[PDB]
């Protein structure tokens, strides 16, 4: 019915439906700042001062094979998701965020089952970074 909750889920839960375009959008820097399914509906911290990260090229969810999610104690505070490595069905991968600015890290690896379309992304944020996310089928 879905993936595990990657990262942490203590903060507020938002739900972002995947459109027919099958896209996942992220803002990231040294951590994961926000996640959405359109350029307009990202869930996470605002672009405020020097915070908020950079909007990255979207992930084609219909092309996604697996994720490797690194979470930990971010050096500027709190437990959040700091990096996501997306491996695609063509064999390529992209790493957003960073593993180098957090302690007490964990890595969670998950493969999207063949024939399962990701229909929704649940995202947990307290208003600064992304603490967790989950795929729903
Ligand atoms: O993706 C997370 C973050 O990554 C990049 O900023 C990294 C950190 O850089 C530090 O120099 C500092 O600016 C951090 O921001 C926190 O700490 C400062 C200093 O106390 C504070 O003013 C801020 O409000 C934050 O609490 C950064 O996290 C950038 O890509 C950034 O845009 C992105 O959010």
Q: How open is the CA angle 84-124-110, to the nearest 5 degrees?
A: 40
Q: Report CA-CA distances (Å) from 72 to 48, 64, 83.
A: 23, 24, 10
Neighbouring C-beta atoms of residue 75, cutoff 10 Å: 13
The reported resolution of this PDB entry, expressed in Å, is 1.5
Could you tell me the distance, in angstroms and rounded to a whole number, from the CA of residue 49 to the centre of ligand 1?
Answer: 9
In terms of Cα–Cα distance, which of 59, 61, 107 is closest to 83? 107
CA terminus-to-terminus distance, the chain: 5
- Please enumerate in sequence order all residues whose Cβ is within 8 A of that of 71, keeping only pairs 6 or more positions apart, or say none: 6, 7, 8, 79, 80, 81, 82, 102, 105, 106, 108, 132
Specify the residue with its C-alpha closest to ligand 1, atom 16: 76
- Please enumerate in sequence order all residues whose Cβ is within 8 A of that of 91, keeping only pairs 6 or more positions apart, or say none: none
Structural domains for the chain = 1-137 (2.100.10.30)
In whole angstroms, what is the distance from residue 30 CA to residue 23 CA? 22
Q: Which two tokens stand for residue 105?
A: 């890290």
Report the structure determination method: X-ray
Pocket test for ligand 1, best of 51, 54, 83, 99 (most atoms within 8 A of CB): 51
3-state secondary structure 9-69: CCCEEEEEECCCCCEEEEEECCCEEEEECCCCCCEECCCCCCCCCEECCCEEHHHEEEEEE
In whole angstroms, what is the distance from residue 104 CA to residue 71 CA? 8
């Amino acid at each position: 019915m879905g993936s595990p909750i990657f990262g942490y889920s203590n903060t507020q839960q938002s739900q972002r439906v995947v459109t027919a375009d099958n896209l996942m959008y992220l803002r990231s820097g040294f951590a994961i700042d926000a996640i959405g399914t359109t350029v307009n509906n990202l869930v996470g911290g605002p672009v405020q001062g020097t915070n908020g990260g950079v909007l990255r090229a979207p992930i084609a969810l219909d092309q996604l094979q697996s994720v490797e999610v690194t979470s930990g104690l971010y050096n500027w505070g709190g437990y959040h998701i700091v990096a996501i490595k997306f491996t695609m069905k063509d064999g390529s991968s992209v790493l957003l965020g960073s593993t180098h600015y957090a302690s007490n890290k964990k890595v969670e690896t998950y493969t999207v089952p063949q024939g399962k379309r990701i229909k929704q992304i649940n995202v947990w944020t307290g208003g600064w970074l992304v603490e967790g996310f989950q795929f729903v089928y």
